[PDB]
Design a binder for this molecule. Structure first.
Ligand SMILES: CC(C)CC(=O)Nc1ccc(-c2nc3ccccc3c(=O)[nH]2)cc1
Ligand SMILES: [Zn+2]
Length: 208
């Protein structure tokens, strides 16, 4: 039931999604090993993901969470990178999309930094890089990220350098405690708590 609608680059909505992508790139402690070496992207396409069943699944869960948290869903727009973004946009998020070995347990992980999500496009740790050239820093191959609407509800704060949410919480927030420039990462434990709103197709750009 999924339709993808291309946004025009002239559309304010294209522009605001692109700005969130570009503005949340940071350097990574791996020197670019997982995600590649870059400071910015070449955005090739931004598509709106339209699926009525999946949207209704999300909004149902959002109301459940809101009612458990003083009418506050604590909804964010966050990035998600995975080799399975094509499955997600058709079928939704579920346990097959969980990072079993994540530092906050087996859940579905999202990032404020688009470049953090970029590290997972080709698998955990970047896998073996792009399928065509086996290059984690490939500047040629098209990559895709999701920019997702995520319900955090009451989030458990973890200060740090499918399972269940911590009791009394709907998510976990991984707060950076060493790298002063890193943004937060978030984990949900129910696929219904995220909707894959935008599919972004892009390349990383080689620094000059
Ligand atoms: C079959 C197996 C490989 C499933 C899996 O672990 N997939 C997986 C998908 C996405 C991510 C992921 N992990 C993150 C961790 C922190 C911040 C963002 C992300 C993010 O955008 N994606 C990790 C693992
Ligand atoms: Zn490549």
């Amino acid at each position: 039931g999924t339709i993808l609608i291309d946004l025009s680059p002239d559309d304010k909505e294209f522009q605001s999604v692109e700005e969130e992508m570009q503005s949340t790139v940071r350097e990574h402690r791996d020197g670019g090993h997982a995600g590649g070496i870059f400071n910015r992207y070449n955005i090739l396409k931004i598509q709106k993901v339209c699926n009525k069943k999946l949207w209704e699944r999300y909004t149902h869960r959002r109301k459940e969470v809101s009612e458990e948290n003083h009418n506050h869903a604590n909804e964010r727009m966050l990035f998600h990178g995975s080799p399975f973004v094509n499955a997600i946009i058709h079928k939704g998020f579920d346990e097959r999309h969980a990072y079993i070995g994540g530092m906050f347990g087996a859940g579905i992980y999202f990032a404020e930094n688009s470049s953090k999500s970029n590290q997972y496009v080709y698998g955990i740790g970047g896998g073996t890089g792009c399928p065509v050239h086996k290059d984690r820093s490939c500047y040629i191959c098209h990559r895709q990220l999701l920019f997702c609407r995520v319900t955090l509800g009451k989030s458990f704060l973890q200060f740090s350098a499918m399972a269940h949410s911590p009791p009394g919480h709907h998510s976990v927030t991984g707060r950076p405690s060493v790298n002063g420039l890193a943004l937060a990462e978030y984990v949900i434990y129910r696929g219904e708590q995220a909707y894959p709103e935008y599919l972004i197709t892009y390349q990383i750009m080689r620094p000059e």
